[PDB]
Amino acid sequence: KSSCKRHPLYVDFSDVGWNDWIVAPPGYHAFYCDGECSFPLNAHMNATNHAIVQTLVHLMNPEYVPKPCCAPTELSAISMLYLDENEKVVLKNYQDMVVEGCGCR
Amino acid sequence: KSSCKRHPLYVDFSDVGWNDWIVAPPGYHAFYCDGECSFPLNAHMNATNHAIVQTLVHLMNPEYVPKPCCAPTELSAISMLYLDENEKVVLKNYQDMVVEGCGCR
Ligand SMILES: *[C@@H]1O[C@H](CO)[C@@H](O[C@@H]2O[C@H](CO)[C@@H](O[C@@H]3O[C@H](CO[C@H]4O[C@H](CO)[C@@H](O)[C@H](O)[C@@H]4O)[C@@H](O)[C@H](O[C@H]4O[C@H](CO)[C@@H](O)[C@H](O)[C@@H]4O[C@H]4O[C@H](CO)[C@@H](O)[C@H](O)[C@@H]4O)[C@@H]3O)[C@H](O)[C@H]2NC(C)=O)[C@H](O)[C@H]1NC(C)=O
Ligand SMILES: *[C@@H]1O[C@H](CO)[C@@H](O)[C@H](O)[C@H]1NC(C)=O
Structure with missing residues (x-):
């Protein structure tokens, strides 16, 4: 509904059932992307x-071409204590877990 | 409507109304991503x-969190001849123009 x-x-x-292998943390602030990518897209989008191209194409062909979508543009990692694929409990940074910024793609 | x-x-x-500033090309093959992040039987999302976290959360709470989006994972550049600030034909390589591949983000 909104931008x-x-x-x-x-x-x-x-x-989510990840506690079979994740010892810490019990959960996290993962965040999510939502909203419209409508013409005209500003610098913040x-x-x-x-x-920007797909934005214009969708205006004239809204039946066949969708608008660009609101997806994460910057993702960050979280440090977690978990069971390895080698049966070892390790403290490793687990990539692409947290949304840092959203954008139109 | 599809995967x-x-x-x-x-x-x-x-x-798109850009024939005035882009001297060449007249157009190009931009491609687009579309389909639901449904994780099908014989496909690699x-x-x-x-x-993956957002998919799990969506399946357990569909009314609260939307599914991840089918966004471009790989984009490529195209070169164009455009009209300058001073009205002169200039060759510039336009980044993030062509969709090379799609995935769930
Ligand atoms: C288009 O894209 C941009 C870029 O992503 C986006 O704006 C970005 O907004 C985000 C928040 O939405 C900004 O993120 C915050 O930025 C600071 C920067 O910190 C500097 O200093 C320290 C110390 O060395 C370092 O951590 C860092 O390396 C930097 O140099 C961070 O301090 C913020 O961290 C907090 O939030 C994180 C998650 O986002 C947590 O993981 C973290 O532990 C911090 O928690 C604090 O705030 C939380 C709320 O976010 C809260 O949960 C806690 O209670 C706590 O108080 C954070 O990373 C980002 O830098 C912006 N970037 C720019 C370039 O402006 C735009 O929003 C986007 N467009 C759209 C449409 O979304
Ligand atoms: C997903 O896409 C990126 C960029 O196109 C690539 O580096 C990566 O190897 C891909 N992963 C899989 C599992 O196909």
Whole structure:
């Protein structure tokens, strides 16, 4: 309904079933992208040139071409204590877990 | 309406109203991503760990959190001859123009 932005989402690992292997943390502030990517896209929309092109194409062909979508543009990692694929409990940074910024792609 | 994948698209510059500033090309093959991040039986959804976390959360709470989006994972550049600030034909390499591949983000 509204323009593309990041929304807050706590994820409990025991709800998703990741607590079989994740010892810490019990969950995390993963956040989620939502909102519209409508013409004209501003600097804050973190758009790609293709998202700007697709924006115009959808205006004239809304039946066949979708608008660009609101997806994470910057993801960060979280440090977690977990069971390895070698049966070892390790403290490693687990990539692409947290939304830092949203954008139109 | 269908499973996340890259689709073809030819963008004609006169149709988008850009024939005035882009001296060449007249258009190009931009492609677009479309489809639901449904994780089908005989397909490989390229997905970040966030998009996997968001999928799990969506399946357990569909009314609260939307599914991750079918966004471009790889984009490529195209070169264009455009009209300068001072009205002169200039060759510039336009980044993030062509969709090379799609995935769930
Ligand atoms: C288009 O894209 C941009 C770029 O991503 C985006 O704007 C970005 O907004 C985000 C927040 O939405 C900004 O993120 C914050 O930035 C600071 C920067 O910190 C510097 O200093 C320290 C110390 O060395 C370092 O951590 C860092 O390396 C920097 O040099 C961070 O301090 C913020 O961290 C907090 O939030 C994180 C998650 O985002 C947590 O992981 C973290 O532990 C921090 O928690 C604090 O705030 C939380 C709320 O976010 C809260 O949960 C806690 O209670 C706590 O108080 C954070 O990373 C980012 O830098 C912006 N970047 C720019 C370039 O402006 C735009 O929003 C986007 N467009 C759209 C449409 O979304
Ligand atoms: C997903 O896409 C990126 C960039 O196109 C690539 O580096 C990576 O190897 C891909 N992952 C899988 C599992 O196909």
